[model samples]
Target chain A: PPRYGWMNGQCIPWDQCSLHVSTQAAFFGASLFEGVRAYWNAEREQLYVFRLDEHLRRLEQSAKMLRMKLSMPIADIRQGVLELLRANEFRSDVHLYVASYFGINHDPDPLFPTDDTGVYVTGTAVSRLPLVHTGISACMSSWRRISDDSVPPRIKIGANYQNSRLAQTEARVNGYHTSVLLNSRGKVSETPGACLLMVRDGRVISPPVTADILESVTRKTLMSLSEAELDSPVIERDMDRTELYIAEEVFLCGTIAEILPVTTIDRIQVGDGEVGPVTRRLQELYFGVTSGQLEAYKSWLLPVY
Target chain B: PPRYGWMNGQCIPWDQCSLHVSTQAAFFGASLFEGVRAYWNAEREQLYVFRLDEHLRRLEQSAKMLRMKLSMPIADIRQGVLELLRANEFRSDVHLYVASYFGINHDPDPLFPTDDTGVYVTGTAVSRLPLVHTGISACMSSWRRISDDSVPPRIKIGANYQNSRLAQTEARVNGYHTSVLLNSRGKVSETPGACLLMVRDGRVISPPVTADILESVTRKTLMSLSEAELDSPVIERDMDRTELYIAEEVFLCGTIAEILPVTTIDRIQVGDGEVGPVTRRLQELYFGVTSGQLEAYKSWLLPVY
Candidate 1:
């Protein structure tokens, strides 16, 4: 079936969502984007969009960093995502890409105005990968994450993925499922597109916001959920490369990955080489809240239907 | 008047030269490009393309680094540039943007095939800026250049310019014409979109290729010309921020920039704050060879007549 996607101000076919190659977004990846997840509740026959407002706020910050003007207000963009999802009428878990970007111009200058913009939201049916349960092997990539002074991993621009692509491609070629990257400071930053969380002494430890990791919405949500449900606060601090090997529980979190466990790092086993107890419990909490099953965190889920 | 541009294999209206925004190039900045300059010899009624083959070779290296496939052979692309230039019939110095990029696909996955590609060449009339003679002010940017391990500045990828844009925009807002970036290792890299060259002790010095800079064609030409014309071997080594302040002459070079002098850096005057003797002499030799006026270096010019 042809999927529906929001473009400019209207819902169109997925393939029709486009901008000119010369546009700033297309040329320099001058677009601010958010990866949102929408989970289908079969019993209630409802689609719950996870933390839509938070994602929209981050998109605004990304625009500010790049000096790009959004084509529409947050409310309209929020409505657009709902409109596209309703048009598609998907009854399964879906990953949504919402973006505001600098669009086409006749100007020959490469540094064109940022005010000319376009907005889009495209949804793809996605489910948790099997690696989430089985746990995946990862390697410490020789490639470093782009630092705050350079590309600034917090931006969520599509061009920033070039760094991710390089690391991810290298890991895949080296027979690993994913790669963990360190920042210029030689401190553990994150996986390509996800945040890293380690377990030490029955507490969660995460690299702080200054570690060149994206200010990930999922990581924030996980931190909140951990304190509330697990009776533990996530310890935000600079982590060393050696810490990954010694951590009892290690996992990656993102909008797409949801909660994925890393069974090994650089060929060394992580905590009996299986999904840890904390990771299993956290994954359950994440799914329960996202699927609109938990009343306490129901506020994070926006009903689309 | 509407300008002409080469798209795919045909000459078209400039605005018509476009690709769908959903392509790999638009999504991930998965494109390799070269900035080429063509000099117009009005007296000879000819257009001379400077370092045409060298630029094409670098484009190939960029493609190799990104694992992107070019849509056409170098010979065909070379022909395309000339064909588009002849179509325009411009009798002035022009800056040409030559690119081979991953194009359209219906894949829902972001990691699409890189072989599906589009090629383009667009030309715009440009001349040497007045700053070439008057000299311009530059500042040491707070923002570091993207490191080789992260984004690899050696490849001329459009997406990498996001780092440049950030630094350049900050410089402009801070009241400087340009900014000089340092690598992650705190060594001087290059200016945004151009290579840096310094004159100290009657010797030309530039940061090495490993210094997180694009391996620039103009810098290469300048090195050869400096040795041949001025009888000095250009030094390739790591440069410190302090060196910029102490250098007798400082300038930036690129295809469009040609040879531009920087008289002041961080408000410090560079040897009386005027275009120095070496810069003036090098600029003369550059224009002479590029314009086909120098018989000894005429081979560097590819005539489009």
Candidate 2:
């Protein structure tokens, strides 16, 4: 179906959403983008946009790192996002994508394609991943996450995903459901697209953003939610590859899957080979805010009523 | 005017060509590509493709690293390249790029695109860079080349170029011709897109592939040419950052630039800031072979007579 989406300055038909081949994003992978989820709360009859502004802030930070300008003002982008969601009449949970790329201007040098930039947004109904209810297995990927000097794995962009793609395909090829990459220092970094958190001696822990992670917003939110509600202290530090294998339990955190438990690594079962209690508590509270149910977390939801 | 180019087993106008947004290259920068030079000789009235087979073999190697299959057979690709060049009737020296990417099949997981793929070729005629006659200044980039475990800077791909882009942008922003990246061990890796060679005590030296540089066919061919014609033995080993700053002369080589001298690093000039005698001799023989001259090097050229 030809769904309406937002591009440049206004709503556009699906056919009109074509990108020029000369664009830097298409040609050289020179751009930034994000994947976020918007939840629907049936009881409130409201669609809640979870941490929309936070996602946009990271997108701007990514744009700065790439030396690109946003296509429109941040406020205008927020308006456009809401408008697009309404136009699609997206009643179910939605996977919202926002992208900005440089379109090469006709120049004497072919490689330095464009200085002019463009941005657009689209939303499609999406159900959650299987990890939502159960746990998935992971393997240590042969590919390492790109660090600060190489490509900055912290930024959300089209180019950085190649690192994720490498880790992912390798895991699937080796008979695992997902992959976790180590940093250049050969320490546990993060899952390809998510942050890895673990319960070691009952303390909730995750590798620091300095460990070459995306500076995940969901990770931050969960850290807070866990401290405030679950009464669990959160720690950020480095851990060895063996640390993951011997931890009591491990899980992944991101905007899409939220918090998915990893029951196995290289077929070594995590704890009892199931979603651990801490992972469940964190996911429960995290979903409570986004799904518009928890009174204490009501401030986190931006309703599109 | 829109020139006709090859795509999906047929020739089409450049403007008529379109790639789906769901394609792996667009979404995740998952693709491998090559840049090969086709030289047009005025006296012979024929176009010569320099090391076309070598470039294809590299593209295949890169495909294997990325877990992808080429969209078409190697023999068909060769035939298509010849046909497409004729279709465009490119007369002057042209840079031809061949690319293959996964086109996602709508599936159980949208993140993982299709195993099916597509390939295409595009050509642009242009004069060479400043390195042919004189030297261009270079600075050690703040950005490092991605290492083997991260994204494998050794392979030619769309994602790999982003690392190049970051380094190039840093150099261009701070007022330099371009940049060279170092490896994790703080050793000279390579300049973006090209392998770096330096003349140390009249002997040509470059970092081995393990030092986090491209497996450059140009670098390999140049090493052979050095010993055969210039009497300069090429050494492959780790070169320190200060070694580049203090080298007698340094140069970069690839399909487009062919051979370019590095005149400065971090504002420090290399040995009188001019192209060295060894670099000059190597460039002469390199051009001689690629320009469809020198019968002794006839095996290197594939003719489209």
Candidate 3:
């Protein structure tokens, strides 16, 4: 399959999408990006992009926090992503990334740039993890995420991944599949690259956006879907580290992973040590919506091919 | 002039010294270094490395903070530096840099590298400022230095320089020669690349090391020498930003810059400005010792040839 990319409003060959080595995004990690997923429905012979508008909105928020300028509007970004996905003719589950970065081109100045900011979008095929409908073990990471004041965690900026990589490496070393990090204040934050959602007393509870969690589109969709499915309101509040142990059901929600139940936190089993009914139901619903099976959520899916 | 550097035990060509880029010192900035000055004594026709032992001791402290191992003893390091200076056969004042860095031969795991650490030493001719001994303008930088908990400011580590570069850029953009930063708690810290000492109420006052200031060798010598000359103890305390506005005299001390007076902070003139009497006296004493005039401080000078 051929891969296509949108660079500065024009489609380009994937291998040719290059950036200057001295760009601030590469050097100082000054770039912001969004992770999106596009699902291919073999039955309908069509590709559907999930929650694209919300992803672009969150990207705008990330740019605002970094004081970066976005050259394209939301509609233009959505259209460009669709165009790239359609041109590639990807039939399997695909991972899409859209990013806007600012920095000097071939210059080492962190404060100035010789060229204008760069914008690009790319997608690739990946097998979705089966744990989306099941559950996975997660360990509490030793390394703490940076404080919001130092670098706000709401943005999916490239620099923030330094902390994520540290936590992920530690978890992998210790035989854990994934890791959860706490903020500097010792309050529960989010998973390495996903948003956390747990069920307690048959109601969903998620860390508030104020907890420096990345404003995730999938996370919001899961919350709203949970409210509609469970017939109750999903709660957003500050979560303590110990809360993970007593939660009846725990899971991570993201564009790449969808909804994967977390069965363990710091070696403690959560709930029945299996995917809870609510998480399983929500994951199935999300899959159906993304694959263009759910007519009600059709508006949320952008058709690419 | 032939410049030599000590690798294991033998001296080798300085420019040919090479280390893998992935060394911990290069990646995570786990290296510590010291800058020492050497003055050529025309009367004795010899080169004197001023306070060589003190610089080595400070380097050791820096290594301890970064958890790096320095293989050579202080005497060996001192002798190696002297040998390099002798090999160069220079008659001019020189600035010497001795650095101990940690890294592996290849891109080891970011979390762990088992490769042996490396040590480097280099020197160059010391150049005086264009406006020598005349005082320069300084500003209070908006960028605050990282806290000791985040990364200690006292150590001359490569990673700590990211903060310094940010502050220095801000100062230069605002038409100032240098900038003084404060600690995270808002107390006066030090200049981007040096330590600040101000003469207040006819007594020498400098920010204490506990105030996150580097324990500068020149700063220590000047403080002790001023106390001995003035018959009073030099006061080290937490300094306030407001104190800079009302100080009688302010000067920065370092290996390269020596004693540079600060006439303005945030564009406000210091008391009577133009190098105060105490500053002049300290400068005279420092120059006398460094140029091989004071017999009492003669032991602090290492003859290269």
Model number with the top lDDT = 1
Q: Tens-digit lDDT track for model 1 on A24-103?
A: 77777777789999999999999999999999999987788777778889999999988988999888888888988877
Docking class of 1: medium
lDDT of 2 by residue, A1-305 (tens): 43887888688776656654545677666667777788998886889888888888888877777777777877888888888888888888888888887776555543453568888887888877766788999998888788887888887877777788778777777888788888888888988778999999989888888999888889999889888887886899898889887888899988876788899999998888878888888888888888989877778777886
In model 2, what lDDT does residue B46 have? 91
User: How good is the docking of model 3, by CAPRI class?
Assistant: incorrect
User: What tens-digit string does per-residue lDDT give for candidate 1 at B216-247?
Assistant: 99999999998888889999999999999899
Error of 1 at B2 (Å): 4.7
Please list the C-alpha lDDT of all candidates, in the order they appear. Answer: 0.86, 0.81, 0.73
- Residue-level lDDT of model 3, residues A95-191, one tens digit each, is 8878786645443223332345767787878777666655788998877765454345676765455456457667776887788888767788887
Error of 3 at B290 (Å): 16
Q: Candidate 2, fnat value?
A: 0.44
True-structure lDDT of candidate 2: 0.81
Residue A287 of model 3 has an lDDT of: 80
Proportion of native contacts found in each model? Answer: 0.59, 0.44, 0.01
TM-score, second chain, candidate 3: 0.93
Give each prediction's DockQ, rounded to 2 decimals: 0.57, 0.53, 0.09
| Structure candidate 1, residue pairs in collision | none
